[PDB]
């Protein structure tokens, strides 16, 4: 039905990476107001919004560490606990659980998902 309230992964224009958030308002003209999980609110073009919740198994993604580093990996698991989503990310034969908002997509990684999940 409506996109308002749905979780998405959407491009932050300042670095071109896609981050977890929610659509909070239809602002017309192919644009949506997003509330990112980190609290930032701004308008984003539909073409830069991916309607996936969760990011699907086997997707190539980027994971942010608690100490400001990023690395590429592949989604191999999901788990819900206390109303919060966690991703199992595989890198070089090993895995690590990350909170939802620490899993992001580079421009190339988000581009792969646009045809199937993009809103523009």
């Amino acid at each position: 039905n409506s996109f308002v309230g749905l979780r998405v992964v959407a491009k932050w224009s300042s670095n071109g990476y896609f981050y977890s958030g929610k659509i909070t308002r239809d602002v017309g003209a192919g644009k949506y107001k997003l509330l990112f999980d980190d609290g930032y609110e701004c308008d984003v073009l539909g073409k830069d919004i991916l309607l996936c919740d969760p990011i699907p198994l086997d997707t190539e993604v980027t994971a942010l560490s608690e100490d400001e580093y990023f690395s590429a990996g592949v989604v191999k698991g999901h788990r819900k606990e206390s109303g919060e989503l966690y991703y199992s990310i595989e890198k070089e034969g090993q895995r690590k659980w990350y909170k939802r908002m620490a899993v992001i997509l580079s421009l190339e990684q988000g581009n792969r998902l646009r045809e199937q999940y993009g809103l523009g």
């Binding site: 300042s14 990112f36 980190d38 609290g39 930032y40």
Partner: peptide, 10 residues
Amino acid sequence: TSRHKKLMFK
């Protein structure tokens, strides 16, 4: 009065 840090890039 606090603002989101992502506003620092605008």
